[PDB]
Design a protein around this ligand. Sequence first.
Ligand SMILES: Cc1cc2nc3c(=O)[nH]c(=O)nc-3n(C[C@H](O)[C@H](O)[C@H](O)COP(=O)(O)OP(=O)(O)OC[C@H]3O[C@@H](n4cnc5c(N)ncnc54)[C@H](O)[C@@H]3O)c2cc1C
Ligand SMILES: Cc1cc2nc3c(=O)[nH]c(=O)nc-3n(C[C@H](O)[C@H](O)[C@H](O)COP(=O)(O)OP(=O)(O)OC[C@H]3O[C@@H](n4cnc5c(N)ncnc54)[C@H](O)[C@@H]3O)c2cc1C
Ligand SMILES: Cc1ncc(C[n+]2c([C@@](C)(O)OO)sc(CCOP(=O)(O)OP(=O)(O)O)c2C)c(N)n1
Ligand SMILES: Cc1ncc(C[n+]2c([C@@](C)(O)OO)sc(CCOP(=O)(O)OP(=O)(O)O)c2C)c(N)n1
Ligand SMILES: COc1cc(OC)nc(NC(=O)NS(=O)(=O)N(C)S(C)(=O)=O)n1
Ligand SMILES: COc1cc(OC)nc(NC(=O)NS(=O)(=O)N(C)S(C)(=O)=O)n1
Ligand SMILES: [Mg+2]
Ligand SMILES: [Mg+2]
Ligand SMILES: [Mg+2]
Ligand SMILES: [Mg+2]
Ligand SMILES: [Mg+2]
Lengths: 582, 582
Amino acid sequence: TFISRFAPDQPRKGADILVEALERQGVETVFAYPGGASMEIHQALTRSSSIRNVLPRHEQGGVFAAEGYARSSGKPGICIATSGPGATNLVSGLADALLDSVPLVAITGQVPRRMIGTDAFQETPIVEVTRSITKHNYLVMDVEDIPRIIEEAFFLATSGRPGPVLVDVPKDIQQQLAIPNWEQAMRLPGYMSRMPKPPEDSHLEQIVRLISESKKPVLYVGGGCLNSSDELGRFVELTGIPVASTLMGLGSYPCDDELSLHMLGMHGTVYANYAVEHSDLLLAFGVRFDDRVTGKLEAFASRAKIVHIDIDSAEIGKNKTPHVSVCGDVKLALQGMNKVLENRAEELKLDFGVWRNELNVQKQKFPLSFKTFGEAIPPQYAIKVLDELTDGKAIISTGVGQHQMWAAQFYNYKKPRQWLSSGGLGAMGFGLPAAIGASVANPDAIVVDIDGDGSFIMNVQELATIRVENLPVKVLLLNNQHLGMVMQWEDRFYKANRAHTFLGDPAQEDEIFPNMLLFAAACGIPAARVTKKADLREAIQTMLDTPGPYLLDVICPHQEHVLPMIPTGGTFNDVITEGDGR
Amino acid sequence: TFISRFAPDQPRKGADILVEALERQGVETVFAYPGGASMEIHQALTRSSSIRNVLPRHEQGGVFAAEGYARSSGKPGICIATSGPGATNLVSGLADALLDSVPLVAITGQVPRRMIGTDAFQETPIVEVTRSITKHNYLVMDVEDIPRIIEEAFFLATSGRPGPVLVDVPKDIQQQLAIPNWEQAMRLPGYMSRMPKPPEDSHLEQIVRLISESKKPVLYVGGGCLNSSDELGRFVELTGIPVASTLMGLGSYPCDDELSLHMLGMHGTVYANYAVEHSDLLLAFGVRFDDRVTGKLEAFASRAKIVHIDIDSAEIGKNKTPHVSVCGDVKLALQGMNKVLENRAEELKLDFGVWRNELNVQKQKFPLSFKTFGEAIPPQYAIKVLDELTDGKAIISTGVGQHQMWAAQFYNYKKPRQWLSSGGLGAMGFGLPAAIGASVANPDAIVVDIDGDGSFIMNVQELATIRVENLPVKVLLLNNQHLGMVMQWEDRFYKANRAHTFLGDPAQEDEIFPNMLLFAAACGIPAARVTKKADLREAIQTMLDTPGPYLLDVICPHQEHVLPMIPTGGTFNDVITEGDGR
Ligand SMILES: Cc1cc2nc3c(=O)[nH]c(=O)nc-3n(C[C@H](O)[C@H](O)[C@H](O)COP(=O)(O)OP(=O)(O)OC[C@H]3O[C@@H](n4cnc5c(N)ncnc54)[C@H](O)[C@@H]3O)c2cc1C
Ligand SMILES: Cc1cc2nc3c(=O)[nH]c(=O)nc-3n(C[C@H](O)[C@H](O)[C@H](O)COP(=O)(O)OP(=O)(O)OC[C@H]3O[C@@H](n4cnc5c(N)ncnc54)[C@H](O)[C@@H]3O)c2cc1C
Ligand SMILES: Cc1ncc(C[n+]2c([C@@](C)(O)OO)sc(CCOP(=O)(O)OP(=O)(O)O)c2C)c(N)n1
Ligand SMILES: Cc1ncc(C[n+]2c([C@@](C)(O)OO)sc(CCOP(=O)(O)OP(=O)(O)O)c2C)c(N)n1
Ligand SMILES: COc1cc(OC)nc(NC(=O)NS(=O)(=O)N(C)S(C)(=O)=O)n1
Ligand SMILES: COc1cc(OC)nc(NC(=O)NS(=O)(=O)N(C)S(C)(=O)=O)n1
Ligand SMILES: [Mg+2]
Ligand SMILES: [Mg+2]
Ligand SMILES: [Mg+2]
Ligand SMILES: [Mg+2]
Ligand SMILES: [Mg+2]
């Protein structure tokens, strides 16, 4: 039974209805930045004793913090901004949440309804702007529509395929007095009629029948299995099928397990891409067949019967036509198949040891490799030390670039929602704010931001947010003085012609620029720099043991390349296995 | 005090709320065509004892009838259609009502909300289709929004610059039981804040000051003066300024008056275009400066101080920048100027007899002329006889073409709303259905459809509507066996090369095809054909004296041309005064 701060017959401001609408949704943390259009909302937030606001230093850091809050907990992330410039700073976060299917609810202030369309002070048509980069958006035109729209916003953002939902609230609606009606029915008739239903037994028995008829099955797990870690693990025990995860599906099946093929795709392991290339049954659970995994669609799984399970009917058959399809929750599809695989266990006699040994041979001949040059710190080795010292139980958020791939390859994630990274949009500056949202949603957890010197500096202002909110956010900065991912593509396909990829100072060429330690010192965050490989283990241990925030500037040779690499539009026969920029 | 057919606490169907919402708006006549999506609305219409439905034989005839109902009475015209094909047949009428600023409310049925977007049976996104050809449209998503949307639809359609408003109602909303709330406030905050205000005295006194300083003033009256016939006539008495009307503003100032310059523009009189060309003060009241009047904007009123009064701020300065502007109702602007012109009458000493004599000389040397060839009926002469036999008190609706121009030139309209014609869009097949709506709104009036053989046949099916509803609609069909307007442009600018403009039968070339008399006979309408000029006066008299509907097939030589003619993009020096196709 919800206990309101107002009487059921007492009129209250629309902003007070908005905050209470969040309280009735279970919202405990918002990321709001104040402004003229949203001052009424911020005043109403102070009256709430259950909703905590984490003030960022940039609205892009506020929406990215809402993503990490959502990616690391399954709950929806709520960010609030003002009209005009405050709303336009959320654009990168909204498009990022849409491509990665992150439940998010963004509330933006707006000019009064009478001033909309008049080029008013700090007015931008944020609904027209964000319609193509959000799952759905609203423009509240009456104070009585607030309880319904907020309920519809959280329902659309969390149900089906999750995504961001923006709610634009004009200022005159926030100030208008009204008595809210919390019993209104949602006006989503076509959406609810198209919601997926529990999977039929005829579809599940046909999948189990294809498993027994197959000799080389491979599991294709992605971001749709973040809530099916137990169901997927039970499915692997009953089948013994090796698991290949996407960049979004890391942690769904433990990377340290013997049946794990780790990541597949452009920068996936050689044995994971080998398994899909020479498979006869591809179980695509919670994936969307991105070109980062398939490359050339004509050659991707060219000899496999494709079984695609997805909660979005628009994804089934988009880039590749499957043989058997199941539109619904992969969590329920696994539960239904586990019952069939257990009763009919001895009837099926499932054993793929011959196919697994074919992959174990490929795993031992082409494993993830990194070369150590003298005392220079290998970035792959540094992340491998972080795995050991944290026992693989740390929540990892990353930026975008070479460090993002090495953090995915050389860290064994035991559970999903430990791996927070921008995969669909690939937005730099995501690592640091996402670690803020993850640390708030998981206070007793080890949160480490494996960031790059280019991605870290984009939202470096959020270091002040970490200090003020006293969050134990660790920053494992892999500094290579370059935009490493773009630098790698210059060495491979452009004759190493540098085109504005060096991030240091050309005057003092051999000086670490910028001095990231002074960035942490400016915000009162203890920091240290490590350059020699021998001092690396003690430095990372000091970062973890030191209470509160900590930044570790790890210097790495910039000539390193992420391996292996399948060029864009290439096949498995075009995989690059060796080479760098020396 | 409105008396409902339902108790204030009695639930009723949404369709019954829709009809009662029309009753509360004063609606007495609708033009509805039944269909699967709108059957609930038609069932609710039979329960209404005050709303009469005129069933057309084509939805395009239904919306055109709603236009004539609106153009001839000032009331809004209401047409109803079903989803899919019924709604798409209203498109030509909606775009026609928008360009001519006709108050219109179109109600279309729609598939249930759960089926929208699923390519359902008889589903078309009529809101997406008609958004650019309507003033505003709605998609009712809840039964409780019906009383508000209908009130907003009639308010937007009739206030400010009138226009068509479409209301899409899904079938499940029509069937849902609810208790309507007729006290809801309209959600039009930005529209009402931008509504024009009464004109200030400083703007009106500056206009009167320019009148006394001018020596060659010309009134530029258009469709915005349809409700200011008395105010405009009072303004002319106090100033003595000659009046030049547009195709839409005919009747605002009597054509038979000595101070009337008749119509101006491409097919306007030579003396009306001469007055604007050699004027020093142009009083543009209720016009939009169409290229059919200006031609080449650089030479249109090149020596005149332009005073533009318009209720739409977007029209002031669009195609030509004025010196003095007044944004508001021209009815109030005339009332304010009449008070200044009467008190300061002897102070101003207004007299433009020298400028009027300069125009009277041009009027006598270049009047509207037509040539009579033997006993062949001149189409200009036939309309001139209709003026005499009806004393100029008949409501005239026309199609589009040569007959439309001759009906505008050779008929003296005493009051506005006697002249119903498609000017902005220029849609053929408008004359016959518009006469239906005018005859219903004005039962005791003489309604005559001056139609062309091409325009009349497009909506010839509405002859059945005239007979069933027993409407005294007269059809003065000027039959020239050709698409005369397109034929005229072939003779002038294409060496008389006929390109599918002959409407008769090439096998029987000298036979009147089709036999329009049998079209009227099929619908039980008395008809007759007149070919000799001597029998023309008795034939038109028989049409008027015969009670009920009547069709008069007037045969005219097709070689006639509408004169004078200013070519597209031309100036006053390029006016064509003589010539035809012989
Ligand atoms: C520099 C860089 C390099 C990259 N390289 C790689 C790479 O080498 N390999 C790689 O894999 N990625 C890589 N990516 C990431 C990438 O572009 C995509 O995010 C990824 O390839 C696709 O993730 P996904 O297949 O799991 O689909 P997601 O984006 O995770 O979407 C989930 C899918 O499952 C479905 N789904 C969601 N919920 C459910 C449910 N409850 N039940 C059933 N289905 C559900 C959704 O409809 C959707 O189709 C890289 C990104 C960057 C920035
Ligand atoms: C074959 C053909 C030939 C044509 N040739 C000619 C021609 O020779 N001459 C000619 O004039 N037309 C001709 N037209 C008609 C034409 O294209 C336009 O409809 C016409 O030229 C413009 O009419 P209007 O200036 O009165 O503006 P309208 O279309 O009548 O609009 C009214 C204007 O007044 C304003 N207004 C409305 N209500 C009010 C109010 N209460 N107070 C103040 N302002 C108000 C509106 O904002 C709008 O700007 C022809 C049409 C056809 C089909
Ligand atoms: C907001 C934004 N701007 C530009 C981007 C284009 N990209 C990249 C990519 C993969 O998206 O190329 O398509 S990666 C990259 C450079 C990475 O700098 P680093 O943080 O130092 O990481 P590293 O460990 O050194 O490699 C750029 C400039 C981007 N994604 N986001
Ligand atoms: C729905 C529609 N289709 C085609 C049209 C293009 N036009 C015309 C025009 C001016 O719009 O040319 O731009 S006029 C015209 C032919 C008029 O046939 P009539 O009825 O016989 O009249 P008349 O007394 O003989 O001259 C055509 C074909 C039109 N306006 N509406
Ligand atoms: C807090 O700092 C400021 C500064 C400032 O100008 C200097 N104005 C305001 N307040 C408003 O502007 N109110 S308003 O007129 O309703 N708006 C258009 S809005 C919705 O807020 O964008 N706050
Ligand atoms: C009257 O003639 C018909 C014919 C016909 O098919 C032969 N079906 C119906 N009725 C419906 O179709 N109802 S419905 O399913 O809700 N619709 C999709 S709708 C809103 O009406 O388009 N009426
Ligand atoms: Mg499909
Ligand atoms: Mg870098
Ligand atoms: Mg203007
Ligand atoms: Mg027809
Ligand atoms: Mg004709």
